C-alpha cells in the first residue's frame, strides 16, 4: 500500500479528506475518500477528470486514484496551509481589504484558466479556497465535483450545490452559464469582507427563497470602511440578471485590484475576524451530516 492515511483534514459533500503520506518518498498528499454511497461515484470520477484537465498554479493538481467496488479514493496535491478561512484568516485577530483582494485575484486566475477552456467550476464556496503552505498566501482552488463543460448557446440546469452559495438561476432551475461562477465570486468576496452572507435565512429553504428574490445591501457598518472600488467590484457581480455580471476577464481588470500594485500603505483599515468567525461556525455545521443538496 503506497499511502499511509492519517488525520482528517476537512469534509465536503462527496467525502472526507485526510492527510496521506506516500510511503516510498515521505511526501505529504491529501486523500479524498468518498462516502459509501454509489451515487457519489460519478462526482468523484468527474473531479478526477477535471483535475487532470487543468494545469495552473492556483488549481489543485491530481496525483493518484484507486477504488473498491463501492468507494473511490483520490490522492491529490496537499494544500499544506489548509482552508483560507478556517486555518488562516480565523487564526488572526484582523485582516485587511487588501489581503482579501490578493486572495480573490488568485481565485479569479484559477477560474480564468477553467473558463478559457470552456469549463465552469459550478460549486465555489468559502471552504474551497485553500492556502498552499503554512503561513503562506498562495491560493489553491479545489472541489471540482460539479465542474462541467459549458456551451454558452446550449445551457443546462445545475441540480446540486450548497444552498448558501448558489445563484438565482440555480434556484429558478434555469440554464447555468459561466456567470454563475462570477455570482459566487461576488458572494465569497462579500462574505470575506463583511463577515456575513447577505442571503442567509433561518434554514436552507428560506436561504433559497432569499437568493431567488436576489436583494441584498451594504447595510452593516463595516461597509463604510471598505473602499468604493471594493463595493463596486461586489456590486458588478451580485446582479440578478446573469448577463449583466462581469465576466472573469473583466473582473480581473476591475480597479479594485489596482491597490495590489502599490506599496502597502501604513493606513489600511483593520477588519476584525469576529463576524467571519460567527458565519464560519454556522457554515461548517451544514457539513456535519454528509450533504443536504438537491
Ligand atoms: N487538496 C487538499 N489539500 C488540503 N485540504 C483539502 C484538499 N482537498 C480537500 N481538502 C479539505 O477537505 C475539505 C472539503 O473538501 P471538498 O473539496 O469540499 O470535498 P467534497 O465536496 O468532494 O467532499 C476542504 O475544505 C479542505 O479542508
Curated annotation (Swiss-Prot):
Induction: Expression decreases with age.
Binding-site list for ATP: 15, 32, 77, 79, 83, 127, 143
Phenotype of the disrupted gene, per the record: RNAi-mediated knockdown either in the indirect flight muscles (IFM) or in all muscles prevents flies from flying without affecting jumping and slightly reduces larval crawling. Causes severe defects in IFM sarcomere development and organization resulting in narrower myofibrils. During sarcomere development at the pupal stage, myosin is mislocalized and no regular sarcomeres are formed. In the adult, abnormal localization of myosin in the mid-region of the sarcomere, H zone shifts from the middle of the sarcomere and M lines are less defined.
Tissue localization of expression: Expressed in the thoracic muscles including the indirect flight muscles (IFM) (at protein level).
Intracellular or extracellular location(s): Cytoplasm, Myofibril, Sarcomere, M line
Domain spans labelled Protein kinase: 3-257
Summary of the function given for this chain in its UniProt record: Structural component of the muscle M line which is involved in assembly and organization of sarcomere. Required for the development and organization of indirect flight muscle sarcomeres by regulating the formation of M line and H zone and the correct assembly of thick and thin filaments in the sarcomere. Lacks serine/threonine-protein kinase activity.
Comment on protein domains: The protein kinase domain 1 binds ATP with high affinity in a Mg(2+)-independent manner. However, lacks canonical protein kinase activity, probably due to the presence of a glycine residue instead of an aspartate residue at position 3306 in the catalytic site pocket. The protein kinase domain 2 is predicted to be catalytically inactive.
Family: Belongs to the protein kinase superfamily. CAMK Ser/Thr protein kinase family.
Assembly notes: Interacts with myosin. May interact (via protein kinase domain 1) with ball. May interact (via protein kinase domain 1 or 2) with mask. May interact (via protein kinase domain 2) with Tm1/tropomyosin-1.
Record-given protein name: Protein Obscurin
Organism: Drosophila melanogaster
Lineage, broadest ranks: Eukaryota, Metazoa, Ecdysozoa, Arthropoda, Hexapoda
